[PDB]
Amino acid sequence: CDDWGLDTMRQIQVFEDEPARIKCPLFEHFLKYNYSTAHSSGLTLIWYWTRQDRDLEEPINFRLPENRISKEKDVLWFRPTLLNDTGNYTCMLRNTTYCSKVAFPLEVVQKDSCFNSAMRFPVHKMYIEHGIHKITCPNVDGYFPSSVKPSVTWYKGCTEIVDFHNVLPEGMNLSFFIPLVSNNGNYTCVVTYPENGRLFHLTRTVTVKVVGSPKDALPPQIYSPNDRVVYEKEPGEELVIPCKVYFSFIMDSHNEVWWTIDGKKPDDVTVDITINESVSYSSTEDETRTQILSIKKVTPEDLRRNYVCHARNTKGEAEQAA
Amino acid sequence: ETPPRFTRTPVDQTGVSGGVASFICQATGDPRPKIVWNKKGKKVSNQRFEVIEFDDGSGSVLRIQPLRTPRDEAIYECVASNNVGEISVSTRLTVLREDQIPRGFPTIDMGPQLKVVERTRTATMLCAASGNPDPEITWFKDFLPVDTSNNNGRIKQLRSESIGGTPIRGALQIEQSEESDQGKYECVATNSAGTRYSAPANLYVRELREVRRVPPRFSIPPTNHEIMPGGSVNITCVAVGSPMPYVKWMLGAEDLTPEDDMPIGRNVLELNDVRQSANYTCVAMSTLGVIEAIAQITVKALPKPPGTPVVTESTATSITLTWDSGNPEPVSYYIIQHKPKNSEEPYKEIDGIATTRYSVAGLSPYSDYEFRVVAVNNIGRGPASEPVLTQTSEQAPSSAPRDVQARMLSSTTILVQWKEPEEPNGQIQGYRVYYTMDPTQHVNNWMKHNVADSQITTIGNLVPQKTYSVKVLAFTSIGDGPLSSDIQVIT
Ligand SMILES: *[C@@H]1O[C@H](CO)[C@@H](O)[C@H](O)[C@H]1NC(C)=O
Ligand SMILES: *[C@@H]1O[C@H](CO)[C@@H](O)[C@H](O)[C@H]1NC(C)=O
Ligand SMILES: *[C@@H]1O[C@H](CO)[C@@H](O)[C@H](O)[C@H]1NC(C)=O
Ligand SMILES: *[C@@H]1O[C@H](CO)[C@@H](O)[C@H](O)[C@H]1NC(C)=O
Ligand SMILES: *[C@@H]1O[C@H](CO)[C@@H](O)[C@H](O)[C@H]1NC(C)=O
Ligand SMILES: *[C@@H]1O[C@H](CO)[C@@H](O)[C@H](O)[C@H]1NC(C)=O
Ligand SMILES: *[C@@H]1O[C@H](CO)[C@@H](O)[C@H](O)[C@H]1NC(C)=O
């Protein structure tokens, strides 16, 4: 049988006592075949699992109470999950002459009533005062059909959202009007829906962080070369001038600051140098990067060469200490 | 003796600084050729260059690591030589910088990892690579290429296929792992832009945990049946093993057990309202292969009529029939129908005949008979065969001529007459008249007069005023019948 071993690349985490539904990796990830064109071709999908902290694999008995674990096509359903359900799962596809099979881990995770869990929230970034940005409750597709309508309580950190300055809950969507840095942090939705006379809960959290406007965005800003202070002194050249570069936020930015002393900074011989570095984020996450350098022995001639400071982050700008 | 000839030549490479490049060269010939690697006509001797020979004697790999540029950028040559001749082939290494990586150049998204496998278990080294064009993934072990070129053996090379915006997944699948499989594995991703190596990964081969995976096997296989139509039956199938298998029933192609609900180790198929006969398949599957087993379901009808019976033996009082069963399935027994040819009444029946041959005794000599054969199975009694006509053998007559009379015609002639014997047992071919003046003699010493089939004859040349004793018999082709008791006539 074609074995793809463990597929740790997709580490799967799901909250305790809540409906999970696990698709089978091989079908679209590795194999090129939907369940449909593979089921029609006489092949059979079979699931096996090894509970973590155990050696031997079991098959899963579907004929069990309230169909707690069920199987639908390439997916296997948990309604709900349990802490015990945690392990390495193996799904298999086989004709008499064929066998592909893959494994993957599944981690059932506990969930304190303030939604503090071992889980990994994604991060949404809203442009500041760029009007509405709506958050959508994620991973909710196909847990229930159109025939049913869920009820989603929203939360900020640990407190239910009822009346807010600019935050409006629209069920499966969260409306942020005029997003202010005041509202940052991990937001949780608890979408609740009934299924066959029992109520199921789904819990997801998105960390939303407000950043600076690309209307405020513009090339680096340097002032340590302002020249209001020229730095002539007895040599005695113990004197170094800073290099302050403030960058307005740019979603994809390449922040690079470099001191250019003679045009070839790369550790010139007369002096013994090492590049030194610093970083600071604002409230709306704009950067200031500052650079200053250190020397072992000092040669009197360097004062007569000028020190220009440049930096480019998606834009190129440059000024000198003079 | 034969000159060197390449069986594997190196191809031009584009690698990345800090990474690895390998060149492969292999030759055959007689004597086995040697290989040297040259650069610009000078034999390589370099701090970053290593040469790895193939164990089988067929080559060398030149491995360069870490790449430096332009230092290593050059044309290199593999030169194969023996005492009969020399041949070289050139190849190029290009080495870029990360600040010159084109968009699309292969990346290692995920690389093989330390893995420890128990001997005889499958070990899979895994790799995730991306690029444009979709890169090929190849594998190295201890600086020599993994030879998977034959997809028959112990080691298999798998590849996921390109749903565009994805990493392409590579697997090095080492079945039936053994100690020699231990070593340092690297996955290599290649496209038209160049080649990138993963970090190396060690494989260890460990002695077994005592727990054993048992292949699936039928604990209670599905046993065949026969039942009347509608007609229900429950056929039980049971498989066991470690791990425990699933059991689905099947009507050959179409699945009978709904897939999303497939029982574990024990599936019993209930067959409501059975109609047509069939083969039913019970498939069981664990992770250690698939097994199968059939249950034969049939409904038998009243047996087809036997083959037309054939007369193979006949006596005067018996007829032996032989026949073909005329049936595909076993027959329990037969019934023989029999009657006189010109009887217009129903056949008499001989029941419970357990073979395909039988001797019908109790018959009369020289008589026409009609026979049929009927087959019977557990279901019941089938239609009769097509009939066979025949005739019992003849015998000598078993009764004397009746009312034998004789009277004087003259002093020298008499008139003898009689009636046909009641038991001729065949065609009367004629009569023999015995007569004498001395009835104390043996009849064979009496005077005799042979006659054909008739009831009266004259006998002359008798001596007058004498008492003549007269006896008459009839004869068939078989022999003489009994003689009538003596009568006397006086001349
Ligand atoms: C998957 O989609 C449909 C079935 O839903 C089928 O027509 C199609 O051919 C499948 N895809 C491939 C690549 O076969
Ligand atoms: C663990 O599983 C057992 C049965 O295997 C079940 O009875 C029990 O409720 C589960 N425990 C928890 C804490 O979910
Ligand atoms: C999965 O199996 C690995 C062994 O390859 C083991 O180390 C790990 O703990 C298992 N994890 C789960 C969630 O079963
Ligand atoms: C099993 O599936 C493969 C791939 O679809 C096919 O090539 C092979 O012929 C199939 N065998 C049987 C017995 O259905
Ligand atoms: C949520 O964000 C808070 C900061 O408000 C911090 O505790 C952490 O980064 C997040 N919590 C979890 C459980 O991930
Ligand atoms: C077959 O199984 C059904 C299941 O309910 C049962 O009612 C029936 O009596 C069984 N028939 C035989 C012949 O065992
Ligand atoms: C069942 O299969 C056998 C082959 O082993 C065949 O000879 C027989 O005719 C089949 N019977 C039916 C009813 O298909």
Author numbering:
A (entry chain B): 24 to 345
B (entry chain A): 28 to 518
Q: What does the publication say?
A:
Vertebrate type-IIa RPTPs comprise LAR, PTPσ and PTPδ, which share common domain architecture with a single transmembrane (TM) helix flanked by a large extracellular domain (ECD) and cytoplasmic tandem PTP domains: the membrane-proximal PTP domain (D1) is catalytically active, whereas the membrane-distal PTP domain (D2) is inactive. In mammals, presynaptic type-IIa RPTPs form trans-synaptic adhesion by specifically binding to their cognate postsynaptic organizers through their ECDs for inducing synaptic differentiation of neurons. To date, five different types of postsynaptic organizers for type-IIa RPTPs have been reported: interleukin-1 receptor (IL-1R) accessory protein (IL-1RAcP)7, IL-1RAcP-like-1 (IL1RAPL1)8, neurotrophin receptor tyrosine kinase C (TrkC), netrin-G ligand-3 (NGL-3)1011 and Slit- and Trk-like (Slitrk) family proteins. To elucidate the structural basis for decoding the ‘splice-insert signaling code' in the type-IIa RPTPs, we determined the crystal structures of PTPδ-ECD in complex with IL-1RAcP-ECD and IL1RAPL1-ECD.
To structurally explain these differences between IL1RAPL1 and IL-1RAcP, we also determined the crystal structure of IL-1RAcP-ECD in complex with PTPδ containing three Ig domains and two Fn domains (Ig1-Fn2) at 3.25 Å resolution. Similarly to the PTPδIL1RAPL1 complex, the Ig1-Fn2 domains of PTPδ bind to IL-1RAcP-ECD at a ratio of 1:1. The Ig1-Fn2 domains of PTPδ exhibit an elongated shape with a length of 160 Å along the longest axis. The Ig1–Ig3 domains of IL-1RAcP are arranged in an L-shape similar to those of IL1RAPL1, except that the relative orientation between the Ig1 and Ig2–Ig3 domains is changed by 20 degree. Correspondingly, the Ig3 domain of IL-1RAcP does not interact with PTPδ in contrast to that of IL1RAPL1. The interface between the IL-1RAcP Ig1 and PTPδ Ig2 domains comprises both hydrophobic and hydrophilic interactions with a buried surface area of 726 Å2. Although Arg196 of PTPδ is positioned in close proximity to Asp30 of IL-1RAcP, no observed electron density of its side chain guanidino group indicates that the interaction between Arg196 of PTPδ and Asp30 of IL-1RAcP is substantially weak. Basically, meA does not extensively interact with IL-1RAcP in the PTPδ Ig1-Fn2IL-1RAcP-ECD complex, consistent with the finding that the variation of meA does not affect the affinity for IL-1RAcP. The interface between the IL-1RAcP Ig1 and PTPδ Ig3 domains buries a surface area of 906 Å2. Therefore, the interface mediated by PTPδ Ig3 is more critically important for binding to IL-1RAcP than for binding to IL1RAPL1, consistent with the finding that PTPδ Ig3 is essential for binding to IL-1RAcP but not to IL1RAPL1.
